[model samples]
Target: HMWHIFERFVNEYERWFLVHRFAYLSELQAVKCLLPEGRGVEIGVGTGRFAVPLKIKIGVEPSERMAEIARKRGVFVLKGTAENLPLKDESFDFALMVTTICFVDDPERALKEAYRILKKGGYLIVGIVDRESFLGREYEKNKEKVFYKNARFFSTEELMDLMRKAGFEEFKVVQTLFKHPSELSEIEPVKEGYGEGAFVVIRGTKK
Candidate 1:
C-alpha cells in the first residue's frame, strides 16, 4: 500500500504541536537572520505552519493533501517538488527550508533549484536536525523499524560540504535545543542514540 505517513503524522493535534512547536522556533530564528524585507519562498511548506505566520510568503509542496492544508491555512502555495520547482529564475529574495533536506530524493538538485529561483545574493536558510548530535545517534539505533524508508540524516560537516558543492557561499551553523511545555527545564540535553536533537542552520548567499 502507498502510505501517506507524513499526512497521518501531522493530522494529530498533539503530534502536530510537538513537531511544529520545535520546528517553528528553529525556523523563525533562521528566517529572521536570512530573509530580507522582501519576498520569500518556503520550500516544502507543509500545512503552512511557518509560511502563513511569516506573512506575504510563497510556498511549494509536493503532496496534494499537504498543499490543501497549507491553502486552508491562508498560504499562497504551489503544487511542486523541490527538485523541479515550478518557479522562474531569480524570482525570490529569500528561500527557507525547515527539516526538509533530509527527506528530499536529491538534495543537490533541490538546492540547485533553490539557487535557480533566488535573486543574486538572495539568502538560502536551511534548518536541519544535526545528525551528529545526541538525538541523531539514538535514532540510528532504533530507526530500522521507524518510518525512515527513504530518509537520511546529515552531519554538520556533511551538510556544509553539500551546500558548498551546490554553489552556496558563506555557510554558518546554529545549534539550539528544543523546548516543550512538558519539560520542566527550558533546555534538555537529548538522550544518546536519539539522532541530533538540536537545530543546525546552514546559510549561504546565492552568488
Candidate 2:
C-alpha cells in the first residue's frame, strides 16, 4: 500500500527500472528453468512484472493499484499477501515468488502458505537478490534511497532453509545478474547453485 511508485508507474517500473532490462530477462530465464507443467500462480506478482512473461495465469497481490496493473496485463490477481493467501489447499500445481521474500511480513509463513496451496509434488520457485552479492551490498549500502529501505534481504542458504522447514523437499538453484543492476549490458546465463550471482532463483518441491 505504501509503495505508491509501483502503483502510479507500473509501466515505468517494468520499463526503466531495470539494469537496462537485463534483470528482467535474467529473472525470467531463471524462473523458466524451474517452472513446471500445470496451473501456476505468483505471490507478490507486482504489476505482472514476471507473471505475464512467465505465462503464470494467476497471482496474489496485496496492493490494489499493483493488482489493477497486473489484471490489465492479463493475469488473474487475488488481492492478498503470501502469508495470508485467499485460496484453497492443494489447488495449484506451482507457485512463484520473485523478489518477494524480502518484502513479505513473514517469509516462513508465506512459504508455508505456498506449501499449503500446492498439490503433492508441486513446486515453489523463489527469486531474490542474494544478500551477500555485489548488487545486494550496493542496495543495502543505499537502503535509505527508496524501496530497498523496507526490504529484508536474505542469503541463498537462509531462504533454502526456510523452504525446507516449510516441508519442501529437494531444491534446485539458478543465479544471474552478476554485474550491478544499472550497469548490466548482458543477460548472464543462469548458473546452477549460489554465491556467484546477485540475483538468485531457488526452486523447491513439496513432497
Candidate 3:
C-alpha cells in the first residue's frame, strides 16, 4: 500500500510539497560523516533520491516503480523489505537507512537483518526525524497526512535501544535541521545529540 503510494511520489518528488528540500539536504550532509568508505547497501532506498547522491552501491526497495527510478540513477536495486534482505552473509561493509525506520513493519527484525548482512564490526547508519523534535511533533499532530498517519515515528533513545537489541554497539549520534526546514536556506553544521534537532543520524557498529 505504501509502496504504491511511493510509486506516484517518484515522478513528483522533484516538486513534492511535503518533503522539505532543505531538510533533505541537511539529512544528506549529516549522513556523510556516518558513511564509511567501502561496499554498502541502503535499505528502503526510495527513488534513489538519497542513495545515488550518497554513492551507495546498492539499494533494497519493495516498490518496483521506486526501484526503476533508482536504477536509472545508476544504483543497483533489489526488491525486498527491510525485515528480510536478499543478499548473502557479510556481503556489505555498512548499511544505510534514511527516513526508513518509521515505515518498516518490524523495526527490530529489520535492524537484525542489517546486522546479518554486514561484516563483523561494520556499521549501520540510520537517519530519522526524531519523534520528540518539532517536525515530529507536527507530524504527530497532522496524522491526516497519508504517510505520517501510517508511520511509527520513534525517539532517539528508542532507536538506540532497538539497535542494541539487534546486536549493535558503540552508538554515536549526530543531528541537524534545528531550524524549520523551510527556513533553512543553507547547509548547516551537524551537532551531537538529539533534543535540539529534528533530523538525527545514529550510527552503531555490529557486535
Candidate 4:
C-alpha cells in the first residue's frame, strides 16, 4: 500500500527533504523541542531524515528500500509497522513518529503500539500537518501529490483523542511551517500551540 508507494518513489521521497530544506528543518525543530532523553526509536523512519539528525538510532520501517537507506544513515531499522512493532514493552524511553500517522492503516493502534514500547513516563512525540491549517486546506484542495494521495490527514484535536485513548497523558505541543514550503526561503520559527502552523508536534507521556 502506502509503503509500496514510498518504495517505488524512493528518490522523490529522499529529494523532497533535500529540496524543502527549510520546511524540513522547521518541522525538525518542532519535534526537537519535545524529544526526550534516553533510548529512542522512530516508527516509520523514512530515509532516516529526521532520525539521523535527531540521533534516534533505532527505527521501524515497512519499506525495504526505505529501511536500506535509513540503515546507511546508521539507523538500526527493524522490518515492522507502526500498528504492530517487533520490540519489547517498556524498552524505550521515547518514541517518535513524524508525519507517519497519515500513512498507517490504523493510527489508534499505532499509538497503542508506541505506548506499549515506551517505559512508564516515557514520551511519544508525533509530528503531523494540522488538517485544519491553511496549508492543510491547500494540500487537501490539490490531493494529487504522490504522498498526499494516500495520506489521511489529522487535526490537532483528533490526534489528541487518539493519544488519550492509547493511554498517553500530560501533553505538550508546538508547531511550525506558517506558510507553504515553496514560500519558505528561511526556516520558520517554531511556536507553541497549533491552528496557525501547518506542521504540529505533540508529545504525550505514557502515564
Candidate 5:
C-alpha cells in the first residue's frame, strides 16, 4: 500500500517532492558523509531519483515496479528488501535510507541486515521525519488518512535507541527544513504537524 502511494506520487507529481524535497541532492549529501573516501548503497532507490545520478552506486529496493523505473533511469538496482539484502556481508562502505525506514515493516531487522553488509566502521546514514517536530505530531493525529498511516515516526532519542539496538554506534542528528519548489508555495511547509517543517538526518557507525 505504501509502495502504491509512492508509485502514484511519482505519477502525479512527476517527482517525489511532496514527501522528500531535493531527493537526489539530499541523498547524495547523506551518501557523501559515509562514502567520502569510498562507495555505497541506497536501500530504497525508488524511481532512480538519487540512483541515476549516482550511477556508480548499488541500489536495493523492494518494489519491482519501482526498480523498473530506476533501471530505466540508469541505476544498477537489485530487487530486495532492507531486512534481507541480497549482497554478501561487508560488501559496501556505507548504506543510505532516505525517508524509507518509516515504511519498513521491520526496521530492526533491516538495520541488522545493514550492519551485516557493511564493513566494520562503515556508516548508515538516514533521513526521516522527526516525531518531536510539529509535522510529526500532525501525522500522528491524522495517520489513518495518510499514505504513511502504517508508518512509524521517531524522535531523535527513539532513533538513537533503535540504532543502538540494531548494532550502531556514534549517532548524530542534524535538523533542517525541506524547501519546496516555488509552485509548491501554497503547499508551503509541505505537510502538517511538521513544526518548523523540519526533518532529521541520523548517522551512525557500525561497531
Candidate 6:
C-alpha cells in the first residue's frame, strides 16, 4: 500500500524536490549536522535525493522502481522495508531515515530494526516534519494530496518515545524549514531545537 503511491508516482515525488528546492535544501542542512561518518544506509531512500548528495553508499527501499533510480545514482540499493531491514546485526556505522517514519507500517519496529543493524556507538539520524508545525498542520488538513493522503504524521515527542523504546540513547536534535512550503523562496536557517520548525532532524546513538 505504501509502495503504491511511491512506485506509481515516483517522478512526481522526485519533482517535489525541484519545486520545493529551498525546503529540500533546508532539510538536508539539518540532516547533515546529525549525519555521522563511516558506512551508512538510507532507509526509504527515494531516487537518491538524500543519499547521493550526502555520500551515503547504501540504501534500503521498498519500491523497486524508486530503488532503480537510486541505483542509477550510484547507490547500492537493497529492496527492503524499514520495519524489517535485510541486514546483519550491528553492521553499520550509522543509519538515516528522512521523512520515512510516517510512511512506515510501524515506526517503533522500524526504529528497532535500525537499532539492530547499527554498530555499537553508531548513530541513527531521523528527519521528519513535526506534526504540530504549520506545514504539518496544513498537510493534515488537506489530506487529499497525493503523498500526504495515506501518510500518518508524528510529533517530535512521539518519535522520541519510539526511539527510546527501540533502545537508542544520547539524543541530539536540529531543525529547519521555518516558513510554509509555498512561502519558502530561500533556504531556511537550521536551528538547534524543535517546535518552531516543520522539519526536525534528530540523532540517537547506539551505546
Clash totals for all models, in order?
11, 0, 0, 0, 6, 0
Better of 2 and 3 by TM-score: 3
Per residue, candidate 1 scores C-alpha lDDT tens digits across 1-207 of 112456556666236456556444554654555455778899988887768767746899887788888898888899888899999999898898877787787889989999999999887878776777665655555677634555678886787788788888976555555543234233333332223445566677887
- Please identify model 2 stretches exceeding 4 Å from their true place: 1-5, 8-12, 15-19
lDDT of each model, Cα atoms only? 0.71, 0.86, 0.87, 0.92, 0.70, 0.90
Model 3: per-residue lDDT, tens digit, 56-113?
Answer: 9799999898888789999999999998899999989999998888888888999989
Better of 3 and 6 by TM-score: 6
Ranking by lDDT: 4, 6, 3, 2, 1, 5
Better of 1 and 5 by lDDT: 1
Tens digits of per-residue lDDT, candidate 2, 1-207, equal 334445665666667545368767877888899889999999999988889988998999888988988899999999987889999999999999988878887888999999999999999999999889998888889988756777788999999999999999789998988776677677878888899898898989899
lDDT of 6 by residue, 74-182 (tens): 9999998998899999999999999898888888889989999999999999999999999889989998858888998989988888898899889999989878877
* Cα RMSD for candidates in order: 4.4, 1.9, 1.7, 0.9, 4.7, 1.0
Model 5 alpha-carbon miss at residue 68, Å? 1.2
Q: Roughly what TM-score does model 6 have, to 2 decimal places?
A: 0.97
| Residues 1-207, model 4: lDDT tens digits | 665788889999888888899999999889999998899999999899999999999999999899999999899999988988999999999999998988998888899999999998899999999889998888877888588888898999999999999999999999999879988899999999888999999999998
Off by over 4 Å in 4: none
Instruction: Kindly give the stretch of ten consecutive residues in candidate 5 with the minimal lDDT sum.
Output: 185-194
User: What stretches of model 1 exceed 4 Å from their correct place?
Assistant: 1-4, 12-14, 18-27, 178-197
Ranked candidates (TM-score, high to low) = 4, 6, 3, 2, 1, 5
Best by lDDT: 4
